[PDB]
Design a binder for these strands. Structure first.
Length: 175
RNA sequence: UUGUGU
């Protein structure tokens, strides 16, 4: 597929970008290798892990299949660990997720799904409940895109008061 | 008790 940056652990600290490029080019073309470094003191030192960006996802998977938990590099006591880099993270759930406050305690997960469905696809909806199963009068709602979330907010924040509630419904991005 | 995933 298209380009992707992988994070790789259990790389010997003595390996440089050049040793790494040779290892990963066995599985697919490599756009870039970047050894994570520690510069707290002299000299700079490898942190025993690197980023490799492959041109294609197919390459990245082929390398993963061949290496992850599979190959133990010279002097290591655990095999290579490889996964997409944190910087590759896209729709972090935490930025499509809404806190819904001041809902009726009789509100069901399905009631909320219904209330917010007209704004997009809801991937998850959960009512916070105490130990006795009683609603805490609030929920979490995750849309597939942040843009849906933002649309729900504009239209639903404080737009009405629900039964037993002392103030209008609260709709905002979750903490 | 405006409650943010035990």
């Amino acid at each position: 597929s298209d380009a992707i940056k992988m994070f790789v652990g259990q790389v010997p600290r003595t390996w440089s970008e050049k040793d790494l490029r040779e290892l990963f080019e066995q599985y697919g073309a490599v756009y870039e290798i970047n050894v994570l470094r520690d510069r707290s003191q002299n000299p700079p030192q490898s942190k025993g892990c690197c980023f490799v960006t492959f041109y294609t996802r197919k390459a990245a998977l082929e390398a993963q299949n061949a290496l992850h938990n599979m190959k133990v590099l010279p002097g290591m006591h655990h095999p290579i660990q490889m996964k997409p880099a944190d910087s590759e993270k896209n729709n972090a759930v935490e930025d499509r997720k809404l806190f819904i406050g001041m809902i009726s305690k009789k509100c069901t997960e399905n009631d909320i799904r219904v209330m917010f469905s007209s704004f997009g696809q809801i991937e998850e909806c959960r009512i916070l409940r105490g130990p006795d199963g009683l609603s805490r009068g609030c929920a979490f709602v995750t849309f597939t895109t942040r843009a849906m979330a933002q649309t729900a907010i504009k239209a639903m924040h404080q737009a009405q008061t629900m039964e037993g509630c002392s103030s209008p419904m609260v709709v905002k991005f979750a903490d």
